[PDB]
Amino acid sequence: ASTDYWQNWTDGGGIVNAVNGSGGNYSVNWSNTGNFVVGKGWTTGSPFRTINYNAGVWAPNGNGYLTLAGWTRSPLIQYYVVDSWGTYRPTGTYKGTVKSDGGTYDIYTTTRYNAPSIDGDRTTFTQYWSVRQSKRPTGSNATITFTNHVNAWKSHGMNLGSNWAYQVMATEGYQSSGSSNVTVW
Numbered sequence: 001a002s003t004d005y006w007q008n009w010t011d012g013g014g015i016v017n018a019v020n021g022s023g024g025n026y027s028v029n030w031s032n033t034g035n036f037v038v039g040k041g042w043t044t045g046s047p048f049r050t051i052n053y054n055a056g057v058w059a060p061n062g063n064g065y066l067t068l069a070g071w072t073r074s075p076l077i078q079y080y081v082v083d084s085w086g087t088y089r090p091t092g093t094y095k096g097t098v099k100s101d102g103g104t105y106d107i108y109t110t111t112r113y114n115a116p117s118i119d120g121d122r123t124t125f126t127q128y129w130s131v132r133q134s135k136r137p138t139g140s141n142a143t144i145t146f147t148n149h150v151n152a153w154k155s156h157g158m159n160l161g162s163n164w165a166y167q168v169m170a171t172e173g174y175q176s177s178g179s180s181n182v183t184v185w
C-alpha cells in the first residue's frame with residue numbers, strides 16, 4: 001500500500017516548514033526548533049511492513065533523527081528505527097543488538113513521564129528503539145524490514161501493543177536547524 005498518512009507535529013518552538021509533496025515525498029526545513037516530527041507513512045502501522053525510502057537530503061544541524069517512528073496503544077508505546085541522526089545518537093537502557101537491512105542496530109528502552117503522546121499533553125509511555133551503530137548512507141533506495149526489529153524486540157521482552165496507530169518514515173528534531181527531503185513507499 002502507498003502511503004496514506006501525513007505526520008506534521010511541532011511543539012511550536014522555532015520554525016518547522018513542512019511540505020506535503022506528491023506521492024510519498026515530503027521535505028522539511030527547520031530553524032532553532034523545540035521538538036517536532038514530520039513524515040509520511042500509514043495510518044495503521046503493521047509489524048509485517050517493509051518500509052522503503054530514499055532520503056535525497058539529510059542535513060540536520062544539531063539534533064535530528066531520520067527514523068521509522070510509530071505508536072501502539074494497549075499499551076501506549078512509541079517505537080523507533082533510527083537510520084541516521086545529527087549531533088546526537090539516541091541511546092537508553094541497552095537490551096541487545098539486531099542485524100537488518102545491511103546494518104547492525106543497538107536495542108534500547110526509555111520511559112517518558114508527563115510528556116506529549118498521541119494520547120495527550122502529559123502522559124507516561126515507554127519508548128522502544130533500534131538505533132543503527134553507524135549512520136546509514138542516504139541518497140539511495142533503502143529498506144527497513146520492520147519485522148526483524150519487532151522480532152528482536154519481542155525476544156528481549158519488548159512487546160508492542162495490540163492497537164496500532166501511525167507508522168511513518170520521519171524527520172524528528174529537537175533544538176536544531178536543518179533540511180530533509182524523503183520519499184516513502
Ligand SMILES: O[C@@H]1[C@@H](O)[C@H](O[C@@H]2CO[C@@H](O[C@@H]3CO[C@@H](O)[C@H](O)[C@H]3O)[C@H](O)[C@H]2O)OC[C@H]1O
Pocket residue numbers: 053054055056057141181182183184185
Ligand atoms: O529526496 C528525493 C528522493 O526521495 C527521490 O528518490 C526517489 C524516490 O522514489 C524512488 O522510486 C521508487 C522506486 O521503487 C518503486 O517501487 C517505487 O514505487 C518508487 O516510488 C526513486 O528510485 C528515487 O530516485 O529523488 C528525489 C529526491 O528529491
Ligand SMILES: O[C@@H]1[C@@H](O)[C@H](O[C@@H]2CO[C@@H](O[C@@H]3CO[C@@H](O)[C@H](O)[C@H]3O)[C@H](O)[C@H]2O)OC[C@H]1O
Pocket residue numbers: 007008009035036037112115116117118172
Ligand atoms: O497530528 C499531531 C499529533 O501527531 C500529535 O501527537 C503526538 C504529540 O506528541 C508526539 O510525541 C513526541 C514525539 O517525539 C518524541 O521525541 C517525544 O518524546 C514525544 O513526546 C507524537 O510524536 C505525536 O504523534 O499531537 C498534535 C497533532 O497535531
Ligand SMILES: [Zn+2]
Pocket residue numbers: 096097152155156
Ligand atoms: Zn538479542
